[model samples]
Target: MEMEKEFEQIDKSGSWAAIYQDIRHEASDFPSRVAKLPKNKNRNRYRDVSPFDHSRIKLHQEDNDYINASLIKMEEAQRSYILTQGPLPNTVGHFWEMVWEQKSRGVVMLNRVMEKGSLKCAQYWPQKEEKEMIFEDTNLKLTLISEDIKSYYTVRQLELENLTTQETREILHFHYTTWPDFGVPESPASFLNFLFKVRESGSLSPEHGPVVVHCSAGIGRSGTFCLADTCLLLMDKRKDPSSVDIKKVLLEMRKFRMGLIQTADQLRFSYLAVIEGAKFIM
Candidate 1:
């Protein structure tokens, strides 16, 4: 309950009416994030929420050649990542093997559940071997990208994009720039709040793990988000903060992925949306 006072305080006005109510009611429990709940109304997506249970899909690595067209097929490829549903017709043994591969590869694999209110997608799952859940299977320099066309991240993502393509590196996602698109009318404020939750995972840090994200597809939005993190690395207080030119950085990102942040509108909003994301951290 007292933990609520630790996280930032944001007025849940404007676009976040109902969600605001739940948050305010939480008062002292401000960031009332719980990891488990019984299945119910709006939260019902699967008949099984039990951990150790096999889901229809499993995560895996596919042959790079299979995605050759997508490497250049701009718009068509943007609709979704290679296998939209992950490894379908999956089994528990399959995931176990993937986990081993993740550890052997040495990448960070992050896990998140976006269920907030009682009426939401009742997110529930078994306890992960945390480290295995979000792993950096391969020891690779990660690429960071945001969903803002106007993002100041051209160079960083560019520097890291090759790592992902060649399967030599990894890429993490930053969703602050693309939150508004998920809703019907679009919600700048809600998007910010959603971004904060992504950051909040840090607030509730569980030691070792990795962060993963996607926006419709795992390109623009995810790319820009990854770029932001690298930018953050530059402003190191303990060390010297390097000089950065927004233009030079932007160009680098586009060379690999057509649009660093998906669209100009997302770029326009990324400026403020991500900072607002900081508010969600506990």
Candidate 2:
């Protein structure tokens, strides 16, 4: 299609710097939400991680605490997605607590167990070999029903139960493993494939509760996934690739969570992925 040429050319037409600057400007009000600050009681487990008060997720339990997570409402998609950092060894209990309180049906993990010789995320869920993991702090039980491994990703069927209440729910865990420590994916094609695979399962459907999405810090790769998914959805709605403003969409999403699309390269990749994905749906 002629649009593809113009679109690819536009990818090179604008300066990634200008777009990056514009995003930084939008984040200038990042601290406007004061409740997510470190001083607040039960604000966050980690010193570096905090969610914006304007959109911070509140735990429903008696001892409500901030878990460095925010519930992002993608109104356009009619979906609620909880964006949070990788669980810490101690915060593992709080992690499952949020999953239980929110009634989330899926968790989109973009980081691996280890990266660059460092532990990025704690093994929050049950290992395939272990078949189950229980969080005593939260009184929850996680059972791994099955796992399907792919070249760059893995899909797991997990059953989560509230041991205290004796209630149970199914969870879909989507893990993207091939992502680099500080870089974009080798190709958006594979990333888009993983995204589509999640969509096909109806886990992202609005009918279900919010799906938890996380990376090492929960804002870089995690932001990229949300940005690309939102843009592609808009393009699908309009049936016109040119109608989607990649930068504008990121800015809007940042309103829900601070520091989305963390780097200039991530922003650039979002554009490429959105454009490439548009071709498929359009």
Candidate 3:
């Protein structure tokens, strides 16, 4: 009932492109403090990848270090997520350090290792049996316990062990292989199905730590996932779903990181997914 009005409001908000332009305008001059840091700047695959100072996740154990990751928490929505860029060859150790330090239960990867004849992300995790990835910098050993291959995605059970402390914990890696680098998924149904799959694993729950979500740059598709999940959660909790403002919600999310929802197409796709996903929650 109330959700129907929410869709109406979205339609009347002029056009998604205009909204996207306005979002970019409002996002101008986002802090680039982390990019200037000598340690983190070199770790970023692209020069543009940097974490905003206000919401940046700092490595307490590392000496004068910064990683291109942001800890995003929407308490009202009961969601906590670590949005980060795809691991570079040099930053894989930092990536695992974040998962171990933040106590993340799962990692949501939305891009392939090589996309469209280019290296989009590093193959950071252990890929197969008898193959273990040892990060000498962080002293973390990643071993694959098992892998479940599916048509659209692959689930890997990885054992992360701290070589220094000999502490070990299991981490679930949910890799969505079909999503394009800078585009939306095949359908909202498939995307929602992946969302529910992650939920069932208790990865997105508050009981566990924040879930790490990454794509190529960790802003476009990554932001869309967080936005849709948070919006759906809000709708499920609120009496009138129309009371939730999607655009305003996105702006709040961008405060934790810069350039979330990179394109008008991605922003437009987010609204459609939220509208379709609200049906089940409503």
Candidate 4:
């Protein structure tokens, strides 16, 4: 019990952090020495990385838009459609009206949406010159497709269909399996086909245009789409993604509009989904 070693102790939530950090620093060199003596390359006991759990999403308020599917200023245009499954021509009609309103202010709408939330089709929605969205039927799980493809687009709208009973975390794994052969290690053809249909980031801008999308409330599915897009683009495709610009891209959704995927659960689940997707694609 050296008197100098017996110092006064203090406690706080992070007090243990210092102890761990000190121990880690002192032990850091052990790995180098231990590595030289390793002999068994065929051991049976192995560690498994914890699989990401998307079910515990904690939705939070974004800094800008109500949903990231639309830009900051045009959020007022987000409409409440149906609760069944897919988009209707009337829904398509309304979205264009949204485009017209925004374009009147000089905002060129990039026509592309992630659709996987509904039961049937606005089968005729895309037929018109202004038909700019996708529609699926009876499968609310397509939100996963939207989440993945939107990662590659810079600024597309994500119109979601309503399944109010649903939440973001519940169907993520289903997304990994749906489309049967899309984006899986087992299905090159299906995966490539999915990629072929996705709009690229280069497609949106003054040199390109603006994108648009929506679901029943534009809160769940649309939120998922925008989160994936923002995370990848801002984070530089998941490489050293902690920069402020990357955060700004994701946070901009809230700053630009009120809803901007305004729930901690959906927001968190979106991030988890995208990160899992990265592993899937690789």
Relative to the true structure, candidate 1 reaches a TM of 0.33
Q: Which numbered prediction scores highest in TM-score against the true structure?
A: 3
Q: What's the TM-score of every candidate structure?
A: 0.33, 0.89, 0.93, 0.35
Model 4, span 1-282: residue lDDT tens: 211121113122324345323323332111111112233111101111010121111113232111112233213223111111123443343333333223311111111233344332333232222433433322222222233323323212333333434432211110112321111133233323322233233222333224343333443444445555444444344444443232234443434322434343443344444444444444
What is candidate 3's lDDT per residue for 1-282, written digit by digit as tens? 344565566578857677688888876356766667776566776787678787888876747568888988897997889999999888899899989999999999988999889998888987787989999989999999999998888999999999999999999999888786556765788888888899999999878899999998999889999999999888889887788888788988988888889888888778788888877764
lDDT of each: 0.29, 0.79, 0.85, 0.30
Instruction: Tell me the number of clashing residue pairs for each predicted model.
Output: 32, 0, 0, 44
Residues 1-282, candidate 2: write the lDDT tens digits.
343554466467766667587778866355534554444534343555567777877776565565778877877656567899898877888888998888788899999888999898888887774767888877999999999999989999998989998999988999998897767876799999999998898878877888799998888899998888877777667655576777677777777777887777887787778768877884
Which stretches of model 3 miss by more than 4 angstroms? 1-14, 28-30
List the candidate 2 regions with Cα displacement exceeding 4 Å.
Answer: 1-14, 28-49, 129-131, 239-241
Residues 1-282, candidate 1, lDDT per residue (tens digit)?
A: 111221123232333344324322332211111112332112212332111111112235452101110111123112111111011122222322332332221111111223122222111111221212211333223223332332311111211212244543322233232233242214346444443444444411223232323333334445444444433333332143334322233444333333345444434344344343334331
Instruction: TM-score for candidate 2, please give it.
Output: 0.89
Best by lDDT: 3
Comparing 2 and 3 on lDDT, the stronger one: 3
